[PDB]
Amino acid sequence: TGVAPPPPGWTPPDRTPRAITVRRLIEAPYRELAGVIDPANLQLLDVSA
Amino acid sequence: TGVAPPPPGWTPPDRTPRAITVRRLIEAPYRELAGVIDPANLQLLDVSA
Numbered sequence: 001t002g003v004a005p006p007p008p009g010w011t012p013p014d015r016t017p018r019a020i021t022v023r024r025l026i027e028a029p030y031r032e033l034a035g036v037i038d039p040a041n042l043q044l045l046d047v048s049a
Numbered sequence: 050t051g052v053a054p055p056p057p058g059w060t061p062p063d064r065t066p067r068a069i070t071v072r073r074l075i076e077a078p079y080r081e082l083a084g085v086i087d088p089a090n091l092q093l094l095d096v097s098a
Contacts, residue, residue: 038087040091040092041090
């Protein structure tokens with residue numbers, strides 16, 4: 001025959017999870033602990049926490 | 050013609066949010082704070098809170 005069938009099917013999504021390339025680790029300063037931890041528990045926190 | 054078509058369609062619900070007419074503001078007494086706040090944080094609360 002002359003005609004040919006082209007690819008178009010469903011084109012499944014390519015989820016295939018990849019590893020994260022951009023990232024970072026940090027230490028939480030007192031600013032967040034002040035606003036996310038209640039005073040009663042915060043005051044008992046030692047300086048080395 | 051003689052016959053006429055009456056309204057009945059779907060009668061869409063009238064959601065159309067309105068403003069609240071009845072309301073009030075209050076100050077929470079110690080009764081609720083006692084039962085909703087743990088003792089450790091409550092005891093540190095000043096008298097002016």
